[PDB]
Structure 1
């Protein structure tokens, strides 16, 4: 969560990023997340808790500080996934940007729909739900993000340790919350190491 350098990113913003991610992963794991394809997203049997990672934030920073809205190429973030977001409000509070970015990515579920088949098929990936799927990717347990105030945008980049969005793999295992992990509160649905 912390022990990160004084590099332009604030503790408040890191906190918000992590809290939003774990909170939203919990909502999904508990069967409480509204799915645009109908009903709610399926309950998750072993949705893993995320931790904040300063090293992942550094590579997210490398993208953000370029002030060009685009995905970085894989080898500029070796082994990591990535979500990107922008707002025209360039001087936005960094925690506010974290909240807005996290909501925009997660919103893909409610807006575009995913459905009850969580295998990441070519069909599913091409529908543009890939920011959401990375946020709730079961095996992704490291989060690191950077918010950069650019000339004409606030630019937010999050990166994700173990990369998610592996084609042909399930986003997460379906089952009752905590049913396939030990360190997990049935009312939260998040598995700790």
Structure 2
């Protein structure tokens, strides 16, 4: 579906499968939380789809080769996770895997806890990459991997944007319990 723009179908596939699989693990109650025990079960965790236009704005960040969050106006209505590795020539699907693990690892390493309301104390804990990956209402994913001179630079963008101050990361409860369209094996809503 997407343009022949330097991004591989293998990396796109890896991004999307990694996000949905890790959203599923959270939703089912299987994700270890460094605050204690596991992340709570999610009532209506939505499945993500790959979006070539979101990819295009992630690309506009990655292609500049500066490790930096974009301004909202450069990614209107989108959230953003960024990652770098010093291995410039890394295979792009390997880089998709490493970045997705790095972001998700905020939950095991730093902790979130049972209270999922996104407060300033929570944001400052350094878990904002993990919260954007598992943000319930975020349903579109687009990413780009750029080989720069001194880094492999990975940007993923997310629509609608997550990490809204004051809102819950996701609604807690039994997997699929607030879903009419459910994949009961993954605990994801379609």
The normalised TM-score by structure 1 is 0.98
Work out whether residues 41 and 115 of structure 1, in 8 Å CA contact, stay in contact via their aligned partners in 2.
yes
The offset of 1:126, in angstroms, is 1.1
Ranges of 4+ aligned residues in structure 1 off by more than 6 Å: none
Deviations 1:89-141 (CA, angstroms, capped at 9, x unpaired):
00000000000000000000000000000000111011110000000000000
The offset of 1:185, in angstroms, is 2.5
The offset of 1:186, in angstroms, is 2.5
SS of the residue corresponding to residue 28 of structure 1 reads: helix
Instruction: Count matched residues.
Output: 190
SS of the residue corresponding to residue 79 of structure 1 reads: coil
What corresponds to 2:4 in structure 1? Answer: 6
Work out whether residues 47 and 172 of structure 1, in 8 Å CA contact, stay in contact via their aligned partners in 2.
yes
Work out whether residues 140 and 160 of structure 1, in 8 Å CA contact, stay in contact via their aligned partners in 2.
yes
SS of the residue corresponding to residue 105 of structure 2 reads: helix
Q: Runs of 5+ in structure 2 lacking a partner?
A: none
Work out whether residues 30 and 187 of structure 1, in 8 Å CA contact, stay in contact via their aligned partners in 2.
no
| Residue 31 (structure 2) pairs with residue 33 (structure 1) | yes
Q: Runs of 5+ in structure 1 lacking a partner?
A: none
The offset of 1:187, in angstroms, is 2.4
For the aligned residues, what is the CA RMSD?
0.5
SS of the residue corresponding to residue 99 of structure 2 reads: helix
